Amino acid sequence: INYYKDAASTSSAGQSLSMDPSKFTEPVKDLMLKGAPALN
Amino acid sequence: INYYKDAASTSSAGQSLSMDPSKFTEPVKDLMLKGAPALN
Amino acid sequence: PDTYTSAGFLSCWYQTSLILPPETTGQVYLLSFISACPDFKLRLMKDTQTISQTVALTE
Amino acid sequence: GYSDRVQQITLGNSTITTQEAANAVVCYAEWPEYLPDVDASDVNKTSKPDTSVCRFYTLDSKTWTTGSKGWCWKLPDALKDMGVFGQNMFFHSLGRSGYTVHVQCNATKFHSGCLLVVVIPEHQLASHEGGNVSVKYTFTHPGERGIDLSSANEVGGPVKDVLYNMNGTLLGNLLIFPHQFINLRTNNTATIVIPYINSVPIDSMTRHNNVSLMVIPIAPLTVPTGATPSLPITVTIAPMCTEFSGIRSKSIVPQ
Amino acid sequence: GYSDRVQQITLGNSTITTQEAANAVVCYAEWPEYLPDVDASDVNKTSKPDTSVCRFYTLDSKTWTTGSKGWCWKLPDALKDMGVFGQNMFFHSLGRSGYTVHVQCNATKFHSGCLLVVVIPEHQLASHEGGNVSVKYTFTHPGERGIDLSSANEVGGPVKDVLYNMNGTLLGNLLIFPHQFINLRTNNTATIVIPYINSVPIDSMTRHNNVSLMVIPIAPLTVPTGATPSLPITVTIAPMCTEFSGIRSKSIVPQ
Amino acid sequence: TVASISSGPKHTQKVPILTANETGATMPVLPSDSIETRTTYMHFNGSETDVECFLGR
Amino acid sequence: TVASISSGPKHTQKVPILTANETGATMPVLPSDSIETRTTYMHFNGSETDVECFLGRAACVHVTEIQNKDATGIDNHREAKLFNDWKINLSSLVQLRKKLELFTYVRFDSEYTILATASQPDSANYSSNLVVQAMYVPPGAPNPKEWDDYTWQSASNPSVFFKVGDTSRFSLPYVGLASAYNCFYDGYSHDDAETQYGITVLNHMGSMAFRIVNEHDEHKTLVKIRVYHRAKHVEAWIPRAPRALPYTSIGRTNYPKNTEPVIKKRKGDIKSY
Amino acid sequence: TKDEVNSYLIPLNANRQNEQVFGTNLFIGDGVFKTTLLGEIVQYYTHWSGSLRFSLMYT
């Protein structure tokens, strides 16, 4: 129950439960498959 | 939920969301169209 | 007024020039107005530097 | 309540309003357009800066006095230094453009005078020396200053005789070129839209000017009694549909 | 027969071929794109010079020697003088751009050495003075020359200590930023595609640099016996999807 | 809501920027009447300028 | 969810453990690519590492102090700590600062808690009960000059009145001018040759002025204000390397000279355990 | 030097060419703008965004 009118006044947000490290761990242009050779 | 009986005791009103500047910006008797000459 | 946030300048120049008819003389004047387009947004209310006081007024 | 008389031209980030126009001329009844593929030759994709080059540049003002003979500007030369239009110009091998020309001159209902505003495609000038003396480069590339037909002959420059259009033809027949008059009693501006006119699809902007704009007093300026005897004339010009192609190092031109 | 190894990037009127690549990084897995309306604020139509600005400019070359500490360039600064990209830059109030960065360094199968090539969004430098000394403008706008981390502290300049990234963080953790290594034994180039990253939709190109490109030797250069002890490193960079807006008079910037 | 619509070159007989202020009106002129604009949205309602809000603290 | 699958002997032409780090990727290698594993489940979600959780607890961001005393003959209230302002920041006390600067741009609503306690360091008959006033002064508002100026009327500026010993709590929406607050800014406010580098309005969060509403008693009372800040509705972009050296200034990245080695030297060889 | 009806009048000179009529920066919360209704309201808020309409009436 929100007792207040504005959105800033609500409690903390709830877990992204998004999670996708590939923008950080695999930003390569041509896709690399694990097990296939790195450099062909 | 109002806890009180009288109307003065309720919280602030809620946004007019009315908004019509023409009583102030265009109080002319004969309607002016933008693009048409001001004085004919 | 703030720098990072500054908006520009407005200037006005003769394009050709003012020409008065005969029998006429001196300076002519322009009146200038300002108003906001329907575009406009204002937010985060605060107190105006345009008014202050040193003792409470009375009747 | 639309009159032929009031007009607004907005091009890019710049707008012109005239409250005393006399219609507008569109050369040869054609409006500027980009270069179609069917007409293309150079294989390079072209660059179309759009609103950064297609806006109105106002050249420095001239002063019409009772002794004026007329002035002449060449395009694209006159704009060789205006903002990004000019940079693009020196930096690409080829470019192409149409223009809107707006010539301004206001007075009062007691003045008289009438200017001819004309656009001449391929205005090849004559040497005042005669024979086969050439007209050096610098002389036909006056820049925003244009050529002042009442200035003196110079060496390597063109002839500046008005009854001959700077080329062996009579002033009276300039009316076969797209043109408009500014008659103080009627008019206060002249506007001409110039489509790109050439025998090749795109050309060099520095070795060849494709139109000369000419403003010539024909009925002498006559001011009311004890008025100052002169009026300024201002020329504002806007490239339209400009395209540049063959980018590289940046041309270096004489003088 | 496609290898991760050979590549061709054609952008505008310029092409790069590498026969010894190690894939390419696209920052944060996003490719440069223009500014969508839903994200727009300034009402001005923008200018997209396209192929005249989106081509490859090769900055002047550096020389990796056994004593090198590393070099740092800022964007769009490094390109402030390249062709029409630069003109557009000084002439509009706002501009926006992504880039393709290609760093080149070839050697032989007897050399060893490994460079880190990294792009740092918003790299705010530190003053070597400590306290709250600022880093003057000129110092953070080296232009195509970039900053040479093995040059001496200067006054009003940034600190040039490599184990600290010029900001109080350790060299070892720069790997959290989009980056690629050039290991003479593997690699001979590094290529990173940079999407536009900012907290505003478009910004000023002169008062704020939005990425520093940094090339840092990490495993020292080791040449074969009686080889010359150095290799040149070349950086070629191409603006991509560039847009300029708010054209006018042409900024004047310190120094 | 659009804050600005897209608008391009103009060469008309219809001039929205010339008016007669003597009439007492403020004609509703916009950026797109005199420069070339691109679409942009308002993203804003004018909530905090409501008179209830202005006098309500 | 499985944390590890079962995997047995391998004799392949397909080697997942050989890679080329020069590419910039961190290949997702697992225990089961190189040893024989058994199934096990995760039993865990990663709840407490969510950025909302990481930045979502109150941190002390500021300690100031004001006193209640006779202002008679004080020529400079501000200077007597008769009242005091604070331009809001999150980079003056380092604990929360290092946490935020793990990101480049951050966007969140703030919840402030303000604790005020009183001290009476010299002989008093009693402890008085003071009410503090905290005014939020946005840039452009008149700033208080005396501890009882017209400014304190605060007719348009949000202000909270609470008692010393108590706590005040309110929450302010994300007041940034851009889409996010810049944790870093490699720019200037304009192309000036001497303008300040790095410090920007892009970060500006307002400012706050404190005073005691009470007139003076016979003794003097020291009131010390502690402001706590909790981020709610957090959004963070572009991770960066953590801060290694100590901080010297609000808003610049500068570290102190002749600082000490931050990497611990081995007591022994590279070979040492 | 003292408020007068005359500071609303921008003068124009006959026969000048090329020259400049007036100049101002656009800090709507200060300077010329500050006492206008627009200026006066803007001052009740901290942030503004939007287009402005500046008109000149000739007399």
Coordinates of C-alpha atoms in Angstrom, one line a residue, chain C residues 1 16 21 27 35 38 50-51 55 59:
Chain C
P1 CA 22.5 32.2 -14.3
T16 CA 19.4 47.8 -44.8
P21 CA 9.9 60.4 -44.7
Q27 CA 14.7 58.7 -33.3
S35 CA 6.6 35.3 -23.5
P38 CA 3.8 26.1 -25.3
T50 CA 12.9 39.2 -5.8
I51 CA 11.3 40.0 -2.4
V55 CA 10.5 43.4 10.1
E59 CA -1.8 47.4 9.8

